[PDB]
Amino acid sequence: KIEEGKLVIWINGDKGYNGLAEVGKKFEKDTGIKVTVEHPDKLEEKFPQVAATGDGPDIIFWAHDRFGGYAQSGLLAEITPDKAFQDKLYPFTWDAVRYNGKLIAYPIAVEALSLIYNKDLLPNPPKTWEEIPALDKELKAKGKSALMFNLQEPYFTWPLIAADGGYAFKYENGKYDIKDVGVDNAGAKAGLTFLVDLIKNKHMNADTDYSIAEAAFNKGETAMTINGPWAWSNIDTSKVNYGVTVLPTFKGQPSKPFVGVLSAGINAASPNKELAKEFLENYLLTDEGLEAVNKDKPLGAVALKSYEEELVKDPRIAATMENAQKGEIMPNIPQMSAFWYAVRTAVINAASGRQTVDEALKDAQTRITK
Template sequence: MKKTLSVFAMAVVIAGALAACGPTNNSSSNNTSSKGTTASKPAKLVVWEDQKKSGWLQKVAADFKKKYGITVEYKEVEMATKMGQQLRLDGPAGKGPDIVTLPHDQIGQVVTEGLIAPLNVDQSVVNRFSKSSIAAETYKGKLYGLPKSTETPVFVYNKDLMKTPPKTMEDLYNFSKGFTKNGNYGFLALFDNYYFAHGIMASMGSYVFKNNNGTLDPNDLGLNNAGAIQGANYMAKWYKEGLFPRGIIGANGGSTVDGLFTQGKVASVMNGPWAFQPYTSAGIKIGMTAMPTLNGQHIKTFMGVKGWHVSAFSKNQEWATKLVDFMTSDENAKYRFTQTQEVPPNVALLNDPVIKDNEGAKAVAEQSQYAEPMPNIPETAQVWTPMGNALQTVVTGKADAKTALDNAVKQIKDQIKSTK
């Protein structure tokens, strides 16, 4: 799901998160422990899966019915924009699902609206997943979902133009200095888009919202601290020295990067797994790996997590939680990957050949070890546009980094205040 400046338009992982610790309190009177179920067994449970992703559920539904005697019905609803909207309508009307799937950056909003219920599962279930993916599913100390897949930007290169991917950004910079000429470029990235720029800035000490023991503080922004300014200046260097073309600024930047890369004019790019198939279909022999290190630090790219959630309107929350646990088992997560190619964050699958031998999946898995989940609190919606505008003025030389970022933070704070 390609991320633009909209928060709603946004892998096996081990560590690195804006909210690195797991839930501190995931108890609820409406929930169940996976140690056992005591509620009356329903005749069926209803699952809403994303578009063109439900085929794997045929087998899993049959397995669940065989084990528990409960029918699992499923339907497809577009996840990024329609899933939450439909739940708002169907849930209160009593005709909604028991389980929905959502991108983690929507959790804060749907929890605030009372649309999903906290989960209470055994620690052994939580330990099934990377810490950062669990952190992404946690809001105000409570766990609201179990992860099904993750995605994050990685380093993608044309194997005909770059034989070996560089280990460091310093090496990549030197390669680009020699390669960039006659309309060809060594490396391109959408550094004026905060989704991509975050990785550079965070690696130098920036953060979006301060993480206080797993809770994000919307009143404490680190988007204009020393690390943020250093990161913005670093990214501007690529533009100022002519290593990036002028056309990769703004809303059309992504299509420009993709066009140049598929024309064989770019040796490498920073992009997400959504780009793998289009690049391959264009006839480019691509390689994928984790991002090169910067100043000895791994680049802390943003990570998006998709998870399974129990509807707050479900009358069968106990059994719905059992089904979520069942769907995200290592066995079923692996099966889902073979059917959808969405990389699961189950730690046990890190070295499984089905992922380890898949170059794209391995790249996402490796980079996700260093990635940070996008903030999942509602205030995040106010970040994207001001930061994008600020970065554009910096990389085009229209404003210095400190002034631009100070103005962006002021605008974000004002917008957050106005929404209270």
Template structure:
């Protein structure tokens, strides 16, 4: 047991929690975050699950927290795909961790299973990117602190085109054709299309997959039907007719074509840009122009930290998560160590990597990936329909209406 610490305004939050559930070489120069102070005291040790790609960046943060407060945070490495399922399985038995680090898209399942505790961030929430905070919300409550965000953007090969003046996606395609390459704008597809990579175009027609509440959390109301959905599906058919979209071009083929200099543009994420720069390519990362007149909103994936509803140390867990990981200093260290765009806007503003800055700018108006259970009823119908429309196998409007009906039926069936 470590020495007691002074906690910042944690008593009321801790009672609420109990009621709800009972790399970089610059690491040595990273600023150590500072803990907060208040009138309540507690002591103990925290257990935190982290995947293998993030345990290295989290270690100096928890070390600084321990040095400042005397409270140990035991980091347990787990496979990323195991964290969510094991959290659901172990928390009810009392064997789970106090805290997990995970992508936000499992939040709906965790809430429905009663394994995650809501937290109160107050004014701290205003310091984060709106899409990042929306990803932490479910059914009107906040359940986590966002750490980093990622999304797709428009990547340009500067050796083929050195300027982008297009303000619409159609203008972008026309400009790209001027490069004289085999492809204009690469958007990976495949036999079942790729709704994730097409989503910025879809939202620009005002056809988001689900409606969002005022706090950014998703409802189960399907929003991609009607006239807006028809306009987008007709646009998909147009892009298919013009060979901008091709279901024979999957993710690997799109990536290789861009590496080979066969297109001036590709819609992709930071997971591919390292391969581009390692190949010696000069690239720029830009926002995706609107196709339908409204903002293009890529899905934003958010890594966050969540507190167990059965934590034996809810006061300490809240101190670490809500009062410590929300600080600029902590988020600065996570960026220095991990190289991911910080969710805290003050930390993101310090990022001087032009590629990461480009992705951050492209995702500022993004939409968090829905974490509601109903999303599992969407992907199959969505991708199959888009592939049929792109490939000219079905009438755009008829196929889209049938897709919406099928999704609604699957949701209603539970």
């Protein structure tokens, strides 16, 4: 199951698992408790299965969106931070990790997609999406692509879809409407249609995924990429002169990236809940622990106020927060998994041409409602 006396931690590969392992080494040096940090592939899907079995990580790291479904399943132990620690973290991050009136994960960092552009290839990033086709034509003349970003994951395409009116679920009266879904509305169709026109006009390739986009940007092949702060470390190693900026507007409206608070959830099956709480509150959710994770891969804005006051000074973090303000914090509700699956199918099918934009978004609407 979950072995006692040890912390097993699941965090995504793009995130700073090596820095988190450094925090775990500090935790071991102080407490005698080994912390093993693992980055299983598809961990957001894997943790529900193993946690339902009672196996799994002691601590699960993901964006909050997935923790509401976990808590509904009962996978997450209700975290019990005292009011002082909640004061240390930002209230909106706490709201992101609140599910059914209970805090079900520890917020670590706020992550929003930003437009990352190569300043040498692109001295000024386009302010609008509509500029990108002409910019791509000019760059293709130069042997370069204007924009390469992950098209397999709905999370990267979502800002374009949301910009003109697309939404996952209607939020009103402090309650998301699971029945009311905005992916097949006109604004979402406009965003997906623009993306598919970029693919059809060969400004973008439908097969482009996270690895291809990151490699193209880091090698200098593409002028722009859309990515979270975690990519900044690889761009820094690449030595590409890059800026992090607001996502381009679509139809005069800001791209709304779905805003994810990286969250640490304690497995309800874990016999190490006290050790996990100790690690997260006094080792991770501290300036030094967040610095260790951030140094491996930038976390974005951090839920911890004291570290974020230092982090906000970074222009890249400022762009992340600007894009987070323009975007919507994700709903953490259980329906969000189904929403992400349906939007993934819609974007992939529309990009490939397997389905029209309208057919894909209609199917996505039916599946996000279900």
